[PDB]
């Protein structure tokens, strides 16, 4: 549901064209850089909601606290009556409106936790087995988990201005171009381990 680069009106535009009553999405906040916004559709109109980003937790300027943005949005999808305004009318997060994926390559697993990307590589992976996944601790960014008796080395990918860089090394126009470069020029962690991307751990059900 998280749309990386859309405005409030753009979110409204989507909800009104593609979405139905009950649709929603999450996006970065334009008025308070750092925070996030939750645009919902109800009765053929849209309702934006401020998501607070303290750095230590997330919340809707009140109510329950959450460690991650996704943990927050899931909670209010499962509990439809908690999100009320002073008027009393309920806002129900029901149909998630999905944006385009970064890369269609099967080494991209979209939503995937580091614990689940670890289990994946330490059960059906090998040395140089890698994947790319959505960064849960930093919405909008991505992660290059690589298997290097098995531990994987996660590396953050910064997504800014619709561009991609790993540790500000070089600029690439897409996730693919970035994954193509470091397969040819492996990166090296602080301890000193070289991160060779030998073969991808592709997805199962495309």
């Amino acid at each position: 549901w998280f749309h990386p680069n859309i405005t409030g009106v753009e979110a409204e535009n989507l909800l009104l064209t593609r979405g139905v009553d009950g649709s929603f999405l999450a996006r970065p906040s334009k008025s308070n850089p750092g925070d996030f916004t939750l645009s919902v559709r109800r009765n053929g109109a849209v309702t934006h909601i401020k998501i607070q980003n303290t750095g230590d937790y997330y919340d809707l300027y009140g109510g329950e606290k959450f460690a991650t943005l996704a943990e927050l949005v899931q909670y209010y999808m499962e509990h439809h009556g908690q999100l009320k305004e002073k008027n009393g009318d309920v806002i129900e997060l029901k149909y998630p409106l999905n944006c385009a994926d970064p890369t269609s390559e099967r080494w991209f697993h979209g939503h995937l936790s580091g614990k689940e990307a670890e289990k994946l590589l330490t059960e059906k992976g090998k040395h140089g087995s890698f994947l790319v996944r959505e960064s849960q601790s930093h919405p909008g960014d991505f992660v290059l988990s690589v298997r290097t008796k098995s531990k994987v080395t996660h590396v953050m990918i910064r997504c800014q201005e619709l561009k991609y860089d790993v540790g500000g090394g070089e600029r690439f126009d897409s996730l693919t171009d970035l994954v193509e470069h470091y397969k040819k020029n492996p990166m090296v962690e602080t301890l000193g381990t070289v991160l060779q991307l030998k073969q991808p751990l592709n997805t199962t059900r495309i």
Partner: protein, 35 residues
């Protein structure tokens, strides 16, 4: 403008650790390949 709704609210763990890439380690490793 935008319509930021004025809401009425208030009615063991083990994660993974990330790393950082060393531009020096990599820029020389690459320079070693071409050589």
């Amino acid at each position: 403008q935008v319509e930021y709704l004025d809401l009425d609210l208030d009615s063991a763990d083990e994660r993974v650790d990330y790393v950082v890439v060393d531009q020096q380690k990599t820029l020389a490793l690459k320079s070693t390949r071409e050589a």
